[PDB]
Amino acid sequence: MSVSEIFVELQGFLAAEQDIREEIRKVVQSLEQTAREILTLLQGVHDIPKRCLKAREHFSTVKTHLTSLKTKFPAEQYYRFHEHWRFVLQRLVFLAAFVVYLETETLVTREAVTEILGIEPDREKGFHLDVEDYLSGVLILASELSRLSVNSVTAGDYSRPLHISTFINELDSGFRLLNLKNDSLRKRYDGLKYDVKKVEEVVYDLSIRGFN
Amino acid sequence: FATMSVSEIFVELQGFLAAEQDIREEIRKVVQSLEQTAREILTLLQGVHQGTGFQDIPKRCLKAREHFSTVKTHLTSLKTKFPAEQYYRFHEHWRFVLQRLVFLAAFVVYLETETLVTREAVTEILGIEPDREKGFHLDVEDYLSGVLILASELSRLSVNSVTAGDYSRPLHISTFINELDSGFRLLNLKNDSLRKRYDGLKYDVKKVEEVVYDLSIRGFN
Amino acid sequence: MSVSEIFVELQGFLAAEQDIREEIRKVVQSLEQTAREILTLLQGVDIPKRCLKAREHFSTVKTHLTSLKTKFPAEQYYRFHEHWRFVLQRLVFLAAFVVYLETETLVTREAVTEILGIEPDREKGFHLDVEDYLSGVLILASELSRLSVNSVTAGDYSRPLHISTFINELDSGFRLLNLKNDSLRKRYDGLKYDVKKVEEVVYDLSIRGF
Amino acid sequence: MSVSEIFVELQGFLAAEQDIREEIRKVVQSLEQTAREILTLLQGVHQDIPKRCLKAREHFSTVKTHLTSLKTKFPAEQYYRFHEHWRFVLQRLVFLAAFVVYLETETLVTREAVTEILGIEPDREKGFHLDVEDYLSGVLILASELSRLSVNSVTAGDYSRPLHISTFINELDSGFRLLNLKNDSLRKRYDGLKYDVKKVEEVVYDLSIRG
Amino acid sequence: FATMSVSEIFVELQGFLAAEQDIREEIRKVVQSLEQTAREILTLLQGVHQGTGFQDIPKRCLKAREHFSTVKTHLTSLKTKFPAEQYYRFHEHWRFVLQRLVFLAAFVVYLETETLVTREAVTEILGIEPDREKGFHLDVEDYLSGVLILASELSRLSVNSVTAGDYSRPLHISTFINELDSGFRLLNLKNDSLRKRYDGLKYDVKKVEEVVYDLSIRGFN
Amino acid sequence: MSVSEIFVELQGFLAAEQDIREEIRKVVQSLEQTAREILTLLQGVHDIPKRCLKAREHFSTVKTHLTSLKTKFPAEQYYRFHEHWRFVLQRLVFLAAFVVYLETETLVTREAVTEILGIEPDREKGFHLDVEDYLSGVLILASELSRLSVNSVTAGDYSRPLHISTFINELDSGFRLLNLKNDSLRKRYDGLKYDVKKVEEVVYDLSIRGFN
Amino acid sequence: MSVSEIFVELQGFLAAEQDIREEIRKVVQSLEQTAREILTLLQGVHQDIPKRCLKAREHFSTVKTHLTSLKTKFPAEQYYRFHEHWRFVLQRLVFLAAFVVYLETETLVTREAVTEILGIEPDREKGFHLDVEDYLSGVLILASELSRLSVNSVTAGDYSRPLHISTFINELDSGFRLLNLKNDSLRKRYDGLKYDVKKVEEVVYDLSIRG
Amino acid sequence: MSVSEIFVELQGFLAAEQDIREEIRKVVQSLEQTAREILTLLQGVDIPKRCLKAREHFSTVKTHLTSLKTKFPAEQYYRFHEHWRFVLQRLVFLAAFVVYLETETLVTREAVTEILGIEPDREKGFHLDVEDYLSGVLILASELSRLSVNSVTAGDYSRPLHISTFINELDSGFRLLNLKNDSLRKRYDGLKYDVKKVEEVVYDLSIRGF
């Protein structure tokens, strides 16, 4: 083709792609919104089960909104616009993990988060939760949890710290089994040591003071 | 399933991470080869920028097209190191090279035909396939970058053509780089990296125009 | 007009503008001045007496601001706004600081305009932009976090708990804002450290037994 | 009031402000578009000059309706507040208009004449203006574009335009000299004129030596 | 010899560069293994920082010393990937790990004996040799770093010992970290990286002192 | 040993090593001095053979000074204090290369530079010239040479540019045969393209003007 | 003159200046050394206190001869010119002297008293002085070291020192309050006092609650 | 003395010092002022007439400097030196700029001291430090490189060749200096670009035929 032809045609393609980036940014703007709302419901901790339920309830909207975001591009092109919802997906994993931790004191599985976010497993096509974002959200949870232990002592709840300690310590232990390569992820993992250290000191302050 | 132990979860993820790391490894392996052939192809063509060699453009074009043959097998190999639907996942490992190959394919086409390779013709040369066939594709962002690079090489080429006596290519290059400038102008570049690279085109346009000015003034219409 | 006619003309417009920037910069200098004075009165933290002396100084602020109001047209407000931003924001902080110290509540954006003698958004002449107001609140959280620390070393073991609750409400309130202003977000990332510090102070007290 | 009340209210204002910026960007995008379309019509020069000029003026028409449209997307008192969203385009439009005028009159358009072409309102009016800084920018852009023009002229056979542009640019430089550039961004851009001056002059030189 | 062509020179250098690249590759390979064992060794010992496990320090020390066995074979292997006289040439590839191993060897020794491993004893544990035997050595800069790291772990350890009821280790750790502080003070640290790391010791000293203060106040002399 | 013993002993070792770093810095200060002197003798180009001889003559002092620097540490510890003379060694390779280019219009071999700097080949022990520093000095020469071509035209010497062009172009071609990995080196190689481009334009200006 | 003449001359001056810095660093290195040696003698505290003090004063002796030596390595008019080469050590020596005095008199050494111990000359004299900024630094260092001391005191059985140090530090804080710290580096270091104040106070608290 | 006695005393010394910094900063403000004026007179590049008007202004510089001489003791010169560095260096540049424009030679450090009315190193009271002098020379090379460019667009085709030779001598002269001053080296890395630009200007002329 002639230069002119080539470019008028690439103009089409460009505009078609910018449409997609727009539809995705639209929904992602909805997700970050909901995520903030869920954060507040939960942040209240600083009636757990009620907060947890109103939160799992909010995740409902994330389910429909995500299946909506699912129709703004062909599934096989997920990873092309990943960076438009990375931040959000990592927050939502954290929030889901936070809910599960608060109600069972356990670590949501990657497969269980997919279920909560109306997402589907890697087996299928469409929207999926990659291992790096999950590990990310989990690390964010450790940060939240270490902060929580602090506040629980000033709330008078001298037991949570001890459970959180064992939990974060297990996470630390978990991450030790991995040989992280990703620059962002590793820079974050380097923060676990601080959360781990903080919780151990909180436990220490209690042990010395009497409770245990 | 329901719930698992922290330990089970991380031992499981340990599998995936290591699997993922293997893919990147194969990919970097093959990509290393690609960047390699690309270097050798670039040399064969760069022979035009040193007086001689500019005497048998056909010959160079043939061997360069000869090389694109290994690029075909290496690319269908690289196609085996990862699952096709995860293209944009590892895409960064081969970006730089892909944009290089686009420019090289376009350069060879321009030396022979003095026209701009189509995006789709570029894919037939690299041994890959269009958007209509699950596999390895050439995104528009990469094609446009390779074309911008070509604009730079051709501005360098007009200058050397003159010192080599060829006073005909500069004029065709000026017309051509102007058509590319106009072509780019009818776009709404959003990608910052690309929009940045496009700010350089203005300079190539300028350079190639002054060469034509130099020849015009010397007495060559 | 001729090429020369055009530039001798603009020369005039440029000189006129630079005159505005100069008068503005003069008064602004007076504001930064009063601001530092007020900050000192408050930094001393018989504190409720300081509020009054502070509230007193805001009077010079009133006059000086209505003064600055005549160094440029009320229409071209955002044409020179970047000459008093720092000061306006600093001022919002002090006012809120005073209001927090005596009422332990957050000044409203509209009350702060009254205190600085600057008319609200309905009445034209000089408005207090949301971004600036919010910037002042942020600087307030910054100060409040430092206060709790000194409050503890001062004997007061109750302010730290109130400050903590307040700062968290602010955090909770900023979260609700879909902050677009690049500069404002950059500053909002600071609240996080303030919340942490304040919360830790409270932890210390609680662990000690207060 | 309570913190929650204050902020939920602020939420309203911020959401309102963001709508305006959106409407503004929506229109500006339309301004940059037509600008590029105008640029191209003129770029054809690098006679036939007159023809293009008419098609360029024909286009500034929509610029008039789109700018009066953008004028209804926000209050006049907030012009300078969102100036940046259209700074680039405004300086771009000044250049074009100025370029069109030069091609058909070899004279420098006036700041007020430009406002009349863009369908904007002069100094004696509110809403949309034409800040001196932006005006001067457009003129500098023009200097640049004309320096290219002379080079491209000589290569077309037109050994005349060069000389005129040379003088024209020399006056602009003179104009900018007797001006105390307070701004800093515009100050650097002015450092680029000396180069456009030097260029156009060497062209005159080549023609002078040749004949 | 005399003189050569530009081409001959670069084709020749091409050999060396590729040779050099091979060495770095082997080295990174083995070093990857070392960082690996180091991680597993670190885990075995980190078991002391979680309530239980602090009950059989002997056992952990044995398995950890068990591991240092593979570190011995891997290090005499890594010793084959490059020519001994070029130690400080590739040294950076294994710095981080070496400083890790120093700290781990020192940590194990401290858990068993409550004393500071000598630099030379550390070399006998890693399977390498002293400055008096052409081969792989442990530079003083790396030893001092590993000791600084150990100071950090032990300050963390005193805190956890207390929550685990052991009120005897903190006191020995305080004495020990103080002796290290004093020891460092009689040096003229020039290396910036190390001098920076040493500024952290002051903090560990402080921490361990407050634990002893907490116990003293509670009633434990 | 006891902590005290350990550290008093490491105090010795530290002081012994600081002595070496001092002796080396002393001589290196002599080398940079001489190198500057040689640069001036040569920079005069902007009687070549006289300048070249007074320069090869100055290299004589580098020969004794280097064999002197050779007695400030055991040869097998060369690479431990390499970074103390890297800069200088790369300058001296460049200056040697510059001399040879100016007198034979050829590229000194790495083995010939070792000879000029009183150094000894890789075969022996002691002071040696690594391939990265050599490639570095050569790249510095390309920069000097491109600058020279410019000045030679304003000096009236319309022939040097043509020889320099062919020479730099050969260097460019030479570096294309390599797959540089070193960050510093590659960041420098990225500069050859500018020197190559400049020289081609100088040749271009001449060709158009008449000479060729 | 010619460029060459100017610079070869300048070469002489620069070479001269560098010699002075070298001589200064040579002596300073000796000052930092003895400082560390002094620090250690005192650090033993973390009675026996008096003993150490004498051995510490015994050491400041060489500080006297080394400082009068460093005083002969450059002209008096250039004191502030090379102040930075010994800033660290001077502030370090102030602290030590001050620390020694506190351990034996529980009082704050005077700026002039310190100059007398270091073998330096007071304000009424040239050459080597004792800048107020450096003095205040040393005092802050001291605050820090004393806060550690009380903690370490209680762990030794000495339930007395804590209370005294508490008061002492509270006065220092008071002293620094009625001071308009213009400097900025010293301003941050002062932000550290509030922490030393808070620490020493919690120690008093623990003793108060215990008995 | 008592803990309180000590701080009420230093308070005095601090206030005294801050007074010095204030008087100094006042005069300095006057110098930057005159400096900009002189720069403008020179930036106009009948140039040799500009030198005189320039040489004229340096007279206010003399008085103002001898003025600044009484705002602090001559002994504590380097105790406040970092208040006029920028200005002193700027001034050295102008003087050398004037001397270059009329003599096409490099002012000596001692001549510049005379021009600024500041006594040399032998006579006490106020010295011109080598670092500052050298900094001024560097800023001069900076200006000179810009001059050649405008000189060409102005018609003068001979200054560019002289400027080139001069700048190279400076480069050649700085090379001889074992520059230790971190700041000075940072600035010396700038000469390299100046040499290049100037040399290219000369190339242009030579290629054109001048």
Curated annotation (Swiss-Prot), chains B, E:
Keywords annotated in UniProt: Acetylation, Cytoplasm, DNA-binding, Endonuclease, Hydrolase, Nuclease, Nucleus, Phosphoprotein, RNA-binding
Oligomeric and partner information: Ring-shaped heterooctamer of six TSN and two TSNAX subunits, DNA/RNA binding occurs inside the ring.
Segments for region (Leucine-zipper): 180-201
Entry keyword annotation includes Hydrolase: yes
MF (Gene Ontology): endonuclease activity; identical protein binding; mRNA binding; RNA binding; sequence-specific DNA binding; single-stranded DNA binding
Residues annotated with N6-acetyllysine modification: 190, 202
Highest taxon of source: Eukaryota
Region DNA/RNA binding, annotated ranges: 89-93
Entry protein name: Translin
Modified residues (Phosphoserine): 193
GO biological process, one term: regulatory ncRNA-mediated post-transcriptional gene silencing
InterPro entries to which the protein is assigned, alphabetical: Translin, Translin_C, Translin_fam, Translin_N, Translin_sf
EC numbers on record: 3.1.-.-
Function: DNA-binding protein that specifically recognizes consensus sequences at the breakpoint junctions in chromosomal translocations, mostly involving immunoglobulin (Ig)/T-cell receptor gene segments. Seems to recognize single-stranded DNA ends generated by staggered breaks occurring at recombination hot spots.
